[PDB]
Design an enzyme around this catalytic site. Sequence first.
Site, mmCIF file in Angstrom:
data_model
loop_
_atom_site.group_PDB
_atom_site.id
_atom_site.type_symbol
_atom_site.label_atom_id
_atom_site.label_comp_id
_atom_site.label_asym_id
_atom_site.label_seq_id
_atom_site.Cartn_x
_atom_site.Cartn_y
_atom_site.Cartn_z
ATOM 1 N N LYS A 279 43.636 26.797 66.176
ATOM 2 C CA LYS A 279 43.025 26.185 65.022
ATOM 3 C C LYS A 279 42.446 24.867 65.575
ATOM 4 O O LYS A 279 42.641 24.209 66.622
ATOM 5 C CB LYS A 279 44.280 25.781 64.110
ATOM 6 C CG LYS A 279 44.858 27.004 63.442
ATOM 7 C CD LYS A 279 45.868 26.518 62.367
ATOM 8 C CE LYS A 279 46.496 27.622 61.597
ATOM 9 N NZ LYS A 279 45.371 28.455 60.908
ATOM 10 N N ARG A 353 50.522 38.171 58.764
ATOM 11 C CA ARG A 353 50.862 39.605 58.309
ATOM 12 C C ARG A 353 51.335 40.366 59.415
ATOM 13 O O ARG A 353 51.910 41.409 59.142
ATOM 14 C CB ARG A 353 49.439 40.015 58.010
ATOM 15 C CG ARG A 353 48.288 40.055 59.344
ATOM 16 C CD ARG A 353 46.813 40.157 58.801
ATOM 17 N NE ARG A 353 46.444 38.672 58.266
ATOM 18 C CZ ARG A 353 45.388 38.534 57.633
ATOM 19 N NH1 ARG A 353 44.244 39.464 57.727
ATOM 20 N NH2 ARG A 353 45.220 37.461 57.229
HETATM 21 C C1 LIG Z 1 41.753 34.341 61.056
HETATM 22 C C2 LIG Z 1 42.162 34.759 59.211
HETATM 23 C C3 LIG Z 1 41.694 36.034 59.250
HETATM 24 C C4 LIG Z 1 43.225 34.328 58.719
HETATM 25 C C5 LIG Z 1 43.531 32.767 58.759
HETATM 26 N N1 LIG Z 1 44.981 32.648 57.938
HETATM 27 C C6 LIG Z 1 45.913 31.872 58.735
HETATM 28 O O1 LIG Z 1 45.621 31.280 59.913
HETATM 29 C C7 LIG Z 1 47.145 31.694 58.217
HETATM 30 O O2 LIG Z 1 48.080 31.965 59.488
HETATM 31 C C8 LIG Z 1 47.218 30.120 57.793
HETATM 32 N N2 LIG Z 1 48.819 30.153 57.638
HETATM 33 C C9 LIG Z 1 46.802 30.217 56.284
HETATM 34 C C10 LIG Z 1 46.491 28.967 55.901
HETATM 35 C C11 LIG Z 1 45.536 27.993 56.488
HETATM 36 C C12 LIG Z 1 45.206 26.556 56.005
HETATM 37 C C13 LIG Z 1 46.072 26.086 55.099
HETATM 38 C C14 LIG Z 1 46.887 27.094 54.149
HETATM 39 C C15 LIG Z 1 47.116 28.405 54.683
HETATM 40 C C16 LIG Z 1 42.683 31.901 57.661
HETATM 41 O O3 LIG Z 1 41.783 31.314 58.349
HETATM 42 O O4 LIG Z 1 42.895 32.104 56.618
HETATM 43 MN MN LIG Z 2 47.555 31.913 61.316
#
Ligand SMILES: CC(C)C[C@H](NC(=O)[C@@H](O)[C@H](N)Cc1ccccc1)C(=O)O
Ligand SMILES: [Mn+2]
Lengths: 497, 497, 497
Positions: A279, A353
């Site tokens: 991230k 997931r």
């Molecule tokens: C790589 C993508 C398909 C999925 C990605 N999701 C994630 O990183 C999740 O594990 C995150 N935990 C989702 C998230 C990000 C920021 C604030 C609240 C919740 C996302 O950016 O939503």
């Molecule tokens: Mn994630």
Amino acid sequence: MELVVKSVAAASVKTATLVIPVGENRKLGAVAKAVDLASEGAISAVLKRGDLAGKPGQTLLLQNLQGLKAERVLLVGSGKDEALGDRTWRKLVASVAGVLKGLNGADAVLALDDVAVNNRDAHYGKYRLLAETLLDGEYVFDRFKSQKVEPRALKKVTLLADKAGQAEVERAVKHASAIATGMAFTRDLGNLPPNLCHPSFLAEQAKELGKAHKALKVEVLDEKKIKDLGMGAFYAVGQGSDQPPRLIVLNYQGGKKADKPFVLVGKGITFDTGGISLKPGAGMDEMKYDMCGAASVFGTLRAVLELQLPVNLVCLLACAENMPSGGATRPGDIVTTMSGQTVEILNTDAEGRLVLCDTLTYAERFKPQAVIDIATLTGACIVALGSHTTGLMGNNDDLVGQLLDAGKRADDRAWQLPLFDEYQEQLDSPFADMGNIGGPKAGTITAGCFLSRFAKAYNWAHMDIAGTAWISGGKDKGATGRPVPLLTQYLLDRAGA
Amino acid sequence: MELVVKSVAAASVKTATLVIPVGENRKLGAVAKAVDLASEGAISAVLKRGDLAGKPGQTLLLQNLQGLKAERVLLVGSGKDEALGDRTWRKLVASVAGVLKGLNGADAVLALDDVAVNNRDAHYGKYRLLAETLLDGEYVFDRFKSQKVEPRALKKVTLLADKAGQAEVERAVKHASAIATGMAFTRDLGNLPPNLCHPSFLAEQAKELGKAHKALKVEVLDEKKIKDLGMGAFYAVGQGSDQPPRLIVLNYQGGKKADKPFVLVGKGITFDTGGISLKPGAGMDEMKYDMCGAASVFGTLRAVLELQLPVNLVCLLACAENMPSGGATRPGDIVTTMSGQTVEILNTDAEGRLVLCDTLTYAERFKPQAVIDIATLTGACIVALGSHTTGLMGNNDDLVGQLLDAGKRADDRAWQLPLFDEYQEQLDSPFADMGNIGGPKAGTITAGCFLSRFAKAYNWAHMDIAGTAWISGGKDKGATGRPVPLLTQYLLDRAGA
Amino acid sequence: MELVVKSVAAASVKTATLVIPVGENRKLGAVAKAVDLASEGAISAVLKRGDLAGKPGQTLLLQNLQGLKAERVLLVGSGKDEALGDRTWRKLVASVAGVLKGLNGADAVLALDDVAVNNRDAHYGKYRLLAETLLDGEYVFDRFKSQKVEPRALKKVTLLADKAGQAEVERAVKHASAIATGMAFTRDLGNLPPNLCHPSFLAEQAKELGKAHKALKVEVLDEKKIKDLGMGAFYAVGQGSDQPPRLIVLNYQGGKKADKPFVLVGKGITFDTGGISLKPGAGMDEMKYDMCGAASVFGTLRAVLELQLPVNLVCLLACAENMPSGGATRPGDIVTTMSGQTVEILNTDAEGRLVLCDTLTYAERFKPQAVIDIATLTGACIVALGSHTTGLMGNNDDLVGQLLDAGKRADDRAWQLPLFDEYQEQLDSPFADMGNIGGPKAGTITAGCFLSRFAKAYNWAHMDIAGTAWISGGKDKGATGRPVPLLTQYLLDRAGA
Ligand SMILES: CC(C)C[C@H](NC(=O)[C@@H](O)[C@H](N)Cc1ccccc1)C(=O)O
Ligand SMILES: [Mn+2]
Ligand SMILES: CC(C)C[C@H](NC(=O)[C@@H](O)[C@H](N)Cc1ccccc1)C(=O)O
Ligand SMILES: CC(C)C[C@H](NC(=O)[C@@H](O)[C@H](N)Cc1ccccc1)C(=O)O
Ligand SMILES: [K+]
Ligand SMILES: [K+]
Ligand SMILES: [K+]
Ligand SMILES: [Mn+2]
Ligand SMILES: [Mn+2]
Ligand SMILES: [Zn+2]
Ligand SMILES: [Zn+2]
Ligand SMILES: [Zn+2]
């Protein structure tokens, strides 16, 4: 805070602060009028001077009035004659609580019977919202402060209602108290920093809870067990970290032995760095809330234990910590899930997931009547539904409807998104049975589609709480405790309580 | 290079190369005129041809002239009939040095007495700048080259001055030589690559220095000691790396037993990846210079040892290597610092202030009269003050003023930035006593504010050398040795030398 | 709001609300104690109940008390028994003002003589800050709201002081009122949206101001005049837009005929899109504040007119609107400035320094004793000094020092940054005399360096108010009116007022 209900007249109650409502145009309902008469018109005399316009939540605080047994009277604005919406009613109550918190009064009496709340009965629904707001508003997380919050003087609140409504107000208080206690547990676990709150810590929390409750049995599955069960996706998420994963099972047998259980599956990613698909730095601290799904399952269980609901409830917490390292999962890895389906991990930041899919397969053994998964799953859900409403998907429209209805009555709302078959193709992989990402279109939905492939054995719903589980910034930054009210409401509904 | 001072006539001196200044319009000062006359007007005759316009640092090199004892005469432009600024003077000297380095002469004589330098006395200030430019200009870092720099013929330079000023020029040479030797040590440590120059290497350097000097005692605190002292912020930075952290203490007791010491605290981050808040790849190699704070403390200490100043000087080098891994600190971690104050680590790339804050608490034991921390701390300092001027903040006006004045006299300038109380709130955390970042506004100042919370026990200043400690690119990429001149000048001032 | 001063006893004054301070531990100063005694101990009796801890700005509002002539008494916390800093004192005043604004009282009496303010006398400095906070806090900008702010009941405030202090409090009120009135004008112009507030609008505002003031003469130079004077940099900025530029001259002749004037030069870029070097969309709306330099000059002039200061003040507003179009200036354009120096416009979003450089040359005709330019010039200044402190540079130390000292006494602080010669080369161009950008290092300084090349004829300073001129977001989004207090204080100082 102690929260009790009486049916005595407001003018008669000995208290540090009596709170009564006042409308626009200084309009007093029957309760406030009787208090004004007992004060020999002192309240209406002050109101005539015009300092309080009566808009919702505005306040005017008086000191000792002859004819009353209250030491102080707090006048609170109730707005125009129109019934209040939920948000306005809860803000009114929070405004009151804010004033009371700053006073040196040991108790207070709320005499708000005349305030109408739109689409809620005057005794149960209206007071569910007031009590939860009052009790959850006491929340303090000062564990890591050198300078502690000086305890507040306010130890007790009395709600006044008429004789006929007293039992229903008491029932609202009982339910709100259980929900608020559960929410405090959720909020503490969410707010704990990730160097302390890791999967082993959550396992210890569960073991402690098991020891404290006779009808609860707790089992903790370590990394070796996860791997041995064939949970290739769950294992892949956790392997990068020095903190190993844990699958925590908390089994509450409150129903008849033959009753099919309700299963809650919570995502417990204690910190989400993204892994090798790392991230950005900005705002990454908020990923300590990526275990808010698991936290809300803990808090719902704690509300259920408090209420002793007569249901069988199986809680599965899928916990891991997602870190980059020399042994971390790579984009392009292919793993075999417990179900036997293979998954191409195209992005290691789509990790929730992965721990969930294996845990959904694990849930089959319980032979459940409903399985609900709760997860801070997609940034896409914040784009679709924002901070106010949880995203909801599922494979059974009756279950989805029950969760929606529970969220409306709890004022912890969700909203359905469709899992149309057309979205499934987005998960196609040339190599494996599926990939773990669907691209930039319909992100909340494709994550639900991915999970749905593991939930075919039972009635299932998925709650994406990425937008509702915490507040990002400002004075109120921190975990919200949602969706504990929706989930607890759903279980009250299934119990018939 | 041997650097000596004589008071003999320039025309009389036996040397490979005599250097004299020439102004615009072929104007000769007293020294140059005397050499012209000794040359039987040869120098004037050549000048009449017009090849040398006499702008500062322009040159014209002559071979053997009848009537002189010099094998070569280098004419160098000194500009118009007005005093030179520091920069122009130092560039003139560097120009001369560049010509001499290319020649096959074993020595040279500089007869530049007639050149006036603005606000510099003719003997001490003028030659502090000349001698340091000459000696630091000899620096070579060729240890990783397969083909070594061809060693240079030039082994000795003699400065000519009049009898009256000879001792003051000698004192300038003594001080410049110590400073330049300190700067060479600093530059070598900065230029060493991070796979070699890690915290354990710096500990070995310190131990070696301790063995070489009787008034110096060295102690090295390892990772377990740092943890056991309660240095939670320092420990958090270092954990992620396979190279463990070191807190290095070098204690020089040159003063009276009951004189309070001066403490220098240097940031020794031997490589800064950013950690989990990982940096972008571009230009990341320059983060081997993230230990230039610690390097400048080593170099100042080396200069003080050479000078045997009569002060008590305690050097604290806070060394760690900031790496991403499965055991690294996460954004959102909360740690307890040695002081007991808690810190929420919102960004693991704000790591220098974390190792520093614990080291500032450690420094209290010495009951110091001044504590100065030196650190390559903020990219924001480069935005504010660029490459030329070190950022300076502190909690004592007299100390800040002493450091500014030292910088002006050493031609190693700093500039104060304010630590107004209004900036503190930017560090507020809802969870901990403070967070480690202040957002995009006033970044150099909020880092200073963070450190100020650990410096309340003593007179303290903070120097942000992110812009002045190295050159990024071009032929001259590499460590500068700043702020060794300022720090050494400050300690000369405190010693009365 | 009318603001008056009296020397009557607090307990004696007939008023809608009497405001008195209470310290921690219920400690009453002489004034509050005398009110308590007149109230027959009612105020001590309420304080004993503990609702008011007495931290600065905390409040407790009482209704009619026997023995007093006030209809209400507002107790306001003044903290522990030490003097308050400026920020705490101003926040205390704003807290009071907030309560009064919500009451239906036509007047109020502030009896805050007890309260000590650090480094400021009891009558003048203390009340400069109180009066300005109170009057500036009355500001409303609801022109574009369909629902207007309800007119407030509070029309008059009386400050009580001893007889000996009355004159000096009245002087403070007179100066604060002028400053607040000028700030309101500045804030209105800044808050106007850019479709209305364009250079021709500002020219109309100036002509209208000229008609209303005897000692003021106004001239407006249009686009053709700017071009014809040879102002090639100013013309280049404005040419892209369908709103043409204006150079507005406002000449106030309040001094002796042969006194040299003070010249204020304000950047009046009514909207800054960046031009062909187009800005990102995020936050671009805030570039309607890019004329806050010019707005602060209008506001300072308005204050000077109110005070009738005996100085000659020439205001030059350099107004243009920076738009992309088929006729806009391009990166790489080279223009000839009024001075004859050529400028390579490397980035069309460094446009304020372009309209300013030509206006600085224009200012030479006035033979000024001081020239100060005020400009929302660099994002780099927000990185260096944030939202609290204006960046200040100049070519005269006395002038810089005078502005700094004015800022301290007005509580509108600035901070000097250096224009060392080393930063000049960053502006070198292979083609023109200079470029208009210096790169990513020392951006605030290099912009000041650019301007300094046009200011050599006179004593000059430059104020970069990019961080202090407006608030970006939240409830308080909008222009601040800074630096009208600093500039007005500087002119009071020069007038001997
Ligand atoms: C790589 C993508 C398909 C999925 C990605 N999701 C994630 O990183 C999740 O594990 C995150 N935990 C989702 C998230 C990000 C920021 C604030 C609240 C919740 C996302 O950016 O939503
Ligand atoms: Mn994630
Ligand atoms: C995360 C931020 C609050 C602070 C951050 N600071 C750092 O990363 C420091 O550790 C860097 N060592 C500062 C730095 C970066 C580039 C060039 C020279 C110096 C910065 O970007 O300035
Ligand atoms: C091109 C750069 C050298 C200069 C550039 N400056 C500008 O664009 C100025 O005209 C802006 N008016 C400066 C600004 C930007 C954002 C907030 C406040 C102030 C900047 O980015 O600071
Ligand atoms: K957590
Ligand atoms: K190095
Ligand atoms: K505007
Ligand atoms: Mn860093
Ligand atoms: Mn611009
Ligand atoms: Zn996640
Ligand atoms: Zn660093
Ligand atoms: Zn601009």
